[PDB]
Amino acid sequence: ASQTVTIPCHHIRLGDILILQGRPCQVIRISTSAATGQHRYLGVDLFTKQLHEESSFVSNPAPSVVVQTMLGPVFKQYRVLDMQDGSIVAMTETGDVKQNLPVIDQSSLWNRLQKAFESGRGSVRVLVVSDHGREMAVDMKVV
């Protein structure tokens, strides 16, 4: 399962990727539980596209400190060596080659990647989520 970071709930917005029920999910709705007052997150699984919901974790790490948090995935950043048929050849920081790295069909990433890739390949990075063995490019950056 994906490595994670803890995100304060005040810093979570629609479109952020959270772990919901153990699954990396794009947040599509943020609401407050009437029963508990806590934030509830409705999200779309990046891989399966199924809906998942999870409420915030309330913790009390110190006197008068009440924290509502969620987990987000730790993104990896890969270089793009080539693009072929909806997948890319990516390279990790240590030179490990991923031949068939899926690109998520989300927010026109493939077209944005293609565009950025045609006008300087070396500066194109993909942000990659790695869940339960599976990896996928879910965003891109230019260095």
Numbering used by the authors: 31 to 173
Give the authors' words:
Here, we present InCellCryst, an advanced pipeline for producing homogeneous microcrystals directly within living insect cells. We have demonstrated the pipeline on five different proteins (IMPDH, HEX-1, Cathepsin B, Luciferase and EGFP-µNS), representing a selection of soluble proteins of different source organisms that crystallize in insect cells in their native compartment or, in case of peroxisomes, readily in the cytoplasm or nucleus of the cells. Importantly, as shown for IMPDH and HEX-1, InCellCryst can produce crystals from native protein sequences, without purification tags or even remnants of proteolytically removed tags, within a quasi-native cellular environment. The rich source of biomolecules in the cellular environment allows the identification of native ligands by co-crystallization at quasi physiological conditions, representing a unique feature of InCellCryst.
The 2nd generation cloning system (denoted as v2) uses cohesive ends produced by restriction enzymes KpnI and NheI for ligation, significantly improving the cloning efficiency, at the expense of two artificial residues at the N- and C-terminus of the target protein. The disruption of the native PTS1 signal by cloning into the pFB1 cyto and cyto v2 vectors transformed the hexagonal crystal blocks into a spindle-like shape. Whereas HEX-1 cyto and cyto v2 both formed spindle-like as well as bipyramidal crystals, HEX-1 ori crystals exhibit a hexagonal block shape. For HEX-1 ori and HEX-1 cyto crystals diffracted at 100 K one distinct unit cell population was found, whereas two unit cell populations were identified for HEX-1 cyto v2. For data collection from intact crystal-containing cells at 100 K, we carefully transferred the cells onto a MicroMesh mounted on a light microscope stage. Cells were then covered with 40 % PEG200 diluted in cell culture medium and manually frozen in liquid nitrogen. Serial diffraction datasets of the crystals contained in viable cells was performed using a helical grid scan approach, available at the EMBL P14 beamline located at the PETRA III storage ring (DESY, Hamburg, Germany). CrystFEL is optimized for still images in high multiplicity collected at RT at XFEL sources and thus, can be directly applied to serial synchrotron data. All HEX-1 structures show an increased flexibility between Phe145 and Ser151, the C-terminal loop region after the α-helix.
